[PDB]
Amino acid sequence: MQVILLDKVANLGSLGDQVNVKAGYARNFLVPQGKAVPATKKNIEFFEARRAE
Amino acid sequence: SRVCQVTGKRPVTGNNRSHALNATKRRFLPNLHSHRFWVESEKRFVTLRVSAKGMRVIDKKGIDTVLAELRARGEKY
Amino acid sequence: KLTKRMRVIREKVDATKQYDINEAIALLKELATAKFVESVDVAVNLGIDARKSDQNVRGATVLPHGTGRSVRVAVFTQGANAEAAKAAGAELVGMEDLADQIKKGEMNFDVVIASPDAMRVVGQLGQVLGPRGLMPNPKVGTVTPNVAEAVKNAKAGQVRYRNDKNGIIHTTIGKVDFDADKLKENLEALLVALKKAKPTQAKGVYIKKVSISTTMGAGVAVDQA
Amino acid sequence: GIREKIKLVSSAGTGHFYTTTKNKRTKPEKLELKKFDPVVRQHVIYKEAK
RNA sequence: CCAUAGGUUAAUGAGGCGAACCGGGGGAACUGAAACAUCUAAGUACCCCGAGGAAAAGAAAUCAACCGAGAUUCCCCCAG
RNA sequence: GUUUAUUAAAAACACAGCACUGUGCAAACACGAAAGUGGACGUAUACGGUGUGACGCCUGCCCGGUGCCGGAAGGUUAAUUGAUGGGGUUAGCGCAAGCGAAGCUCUUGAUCGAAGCCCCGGUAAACGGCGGCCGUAACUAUAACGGUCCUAAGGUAGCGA
RNA sequence: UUGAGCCUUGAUGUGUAGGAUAGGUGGGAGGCUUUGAAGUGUGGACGCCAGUCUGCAUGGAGCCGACCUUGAAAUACCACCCUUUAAUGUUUGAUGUUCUAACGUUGACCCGUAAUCCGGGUUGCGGACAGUGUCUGGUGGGUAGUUUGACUGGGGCGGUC
RNA sequence: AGCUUGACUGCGAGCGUGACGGCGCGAGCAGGUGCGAAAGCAGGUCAUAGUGAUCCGGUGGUUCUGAAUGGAAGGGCCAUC
RNA sequence: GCCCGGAUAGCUCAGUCGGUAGAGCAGGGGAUUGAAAAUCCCCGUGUCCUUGGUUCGAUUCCGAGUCCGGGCACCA
């Protein structure tokens, strides 16, 4: 899946970007802890506002 | 019972169609796996015995969206 | 291994690129920095089994613009065929009874042609023409009654092609001095030839890889099609 | 057994062909005979032999 | 810590039985093929769950064929 | 001691003992679609299977076949992956024969690919095998012995109608 | 870190006559060297220690081709490649280790709860293994469904069809 | 021994033998060939055994069919495995 | 049916990235010992299964085919 990052993280750090990460790394450590979030299209625009604004 | 608590999938009966076409009743046991899901709206590890495909359905809709469908049909977690 | 004069032109060609017959003819002209008019050559890895008689690519083709070089022809005929060979344009025309004299010191030519009724005399002692690709053979189009014609095509710019016992074939198609468009017509003239000489049992892509090159130059990948 | 089974094909553009057998042992050469052809309605050459 | 799990009380409803019909989950064998495994027997016997007075199905991503018909179900032909 | 209750109570079965082998614990194994339980609320001086059957003297030869326990260069090889080639459809180009892009589709089936089997090394208190034809020891006879039959080896002790 | 394909880049070939550790087909009587060569002096290196290549450097201004031989002639130069082999890279895989956030926990502790079950939580030890589901090959009388012909001086054997 | 392919293709009145399936003989007719000067002969070999039903597929030919139309797939027919 | 390997002297077998094809067993003989044993050596009766291709040259390398050995595939 794509999903956006909230924290820094390792090889994909950017504090906010869409990277094709395996559903295993996301739904297990990333999201289930606070470092990523599923790009349900409703969040990609949500955090997008944080960028500009 | 080995039945997905989400997709509702359960052991379906079939037949072991061999080379000589010898019918033999069997079953397709779903790939269920007791996984511990975390809910941000409740702060708890809601463990649910769902199949492989049942988990992906939770990724799109959401653990909160899935549970909402459970409490609706009497499902207790 | 190579020298600057060779490492300089190597940078003018992309090893990992399959140029077109129209782009290869122009680039080839820039791959000849030698101090003499180099000749154009085109090799290709035929997808055939060189170790199978029923899969041999051999014959002759006439270039639409010749090879751009003089080809001293030497024909060996008998009877009236002697005159027809001389008036044809053959540089040297020796009789069948004087075939030994040529082996002595009169051996200066690029190609040899003979008549069917004179292959039993030239056939023997051919240990000097065979290993030099000068041994007349009805296959290469150097053995036929109409020697008058055969010689004319050779003097016009006809080139022979024969795949080695490995699966590769190379033949001249002119010089580098020739214009771009000119070379293209000549190159395609050969490409269409091999396709016509393709064996029936040939399986897989007959044309696996084609590449052109000069005398003192590197090769260039080109799409035959 | 041994004496294989062949089929003479019409040398013409037709697809007609006659069936028969031969001795591949001492007769490996390609058989060829002129027979009638119901398609072209003319005796055409018949080759092809195993 | 919050919050839940849990505990208590109250209201409502459910539980059982029952000849057939009905939907769904399970699902043979004997037998026939003059044997026999594909096949047939049969999605029948039987087991189990649920509901009604009917149940089930049901308002086209269906057929037809250039002319139309227009949800489902039932009966007679089509056709052994 | 046990056993065919009701025609066989025996040389059968069981038996302490001995041997091989499996098992490191959530054991092997067994009952079960699963859970669980038994094995055992035990821990290799334990437990399960098999074989033999107090004790005394001892328990040989043979690893080809069939199994088991290992190793291993090369060879073959499933699912899956889908390289090439061929065919159907058709925008266009052809005055017509014909060919025919993209897309779609059908078909054909390289490459990727562990076990297994074969091969090789062991195991016979594993299932079993432990025989034929000749020559010979200077009275006969027999055969200590020596070849062969290529099936692995061809009867030690003891005993023997 | 590495086994194999693939693509450039560099090595690489001891039948015999012989100036000599000749790959096969082709182009080819000249390119090469003052963008500083032969010829000597070392290191690295292949290896049948026969011989050859090369960076650096000394030096400094040459080295060659039918040659008369060889079935086949050039380290004179350049291409498409093979045999063999080495190093980057690319591609498809393989191996092992570390880590923890799933998963396992018939370790300890706490609570529900004066409870050997179970559930939640904490912690420790393992760990993307194990296990399980689907597909697949092998194995499989533990188990299940059956076949295992008929003539025939009865049947069986033999023979026959 | 010379010349060659009638061991050919579409039919065949009539007749023989079998429960049937099936098999066998057949002058002659039409088209196209070989041999001989010609009259004629040849639809394998002196004749009689040298054999394999069906179903299911493969190959070539034939627009016969082409589940909306135009094709194609498939099927059918002939030859054949 | 597909694929790999094998077929070598009378027998059992080794062998090559393309070229005088060897060993063992057996037999005759020789050497050696004073002699009989042993031991060692010499002596060979081949289209390298069959038909082609490349080559100056094929038991080799390649293609087809046959027998045999191993595995897999094998629904009229």
What CATH number corresponds to the domain at position B62? 2.30.170.40
List chain B residues with CB under 8 Å of A23: 56, 59
Count how many pairs of residues, chain A against chain B, have C-beta atoms within 8 Å: 12
CB < 8 Å & 24+ apart, contacts of A10-18: A16/A47, A16/A50, A16/A51, A18/A44
User: In terms of residue numbers, what domain contains B5?
Assistant: 1-77
* Residue of D50, D45, D25, D26 whose CA lies nearest to D35: D45
- φ and ψ at residue C197, rounded to 5 degrees: -100, 10
**CB distance A23–B56 less than 8 Å?**
yes
- Helix or strand (DSSP H, E) at C74: strand C73-76
* Residue of B77, B66, B30, B7 whose CA lies nearest to A27: B66
**CB distance A23–B59 less than 8 Å?**
yes
- If one counts the domains in chain B, the total is 1
Q: Are C107 and C129 in contact (CB under 8 A)?
A: no
* Residue of C105, C110, C106, C104 whose CA lies nearest to C90: C110
In chain D, residues 6 through 35 whose Cβ sits under 7 angstroms from any atom of nucleic acid strand H: 7, 14-20, 33-35
**What's the rounded Cα separation, in Å, for the pair C17 and C4?**
22
CB burial readout B11-27, b (16+ within 10 A) else e: eeeeeeeeeeeeeeeee
Which residue in A has a C-alpha nearest to residue B35's C-alpha?
A28
C46: three-class secondary structure by DSSP: strand
Give me the resolution in angstroms, 1 decimal: 7.6
* Residue of C181, C177, C163, C176 whose CA lies nearest to C212: C176
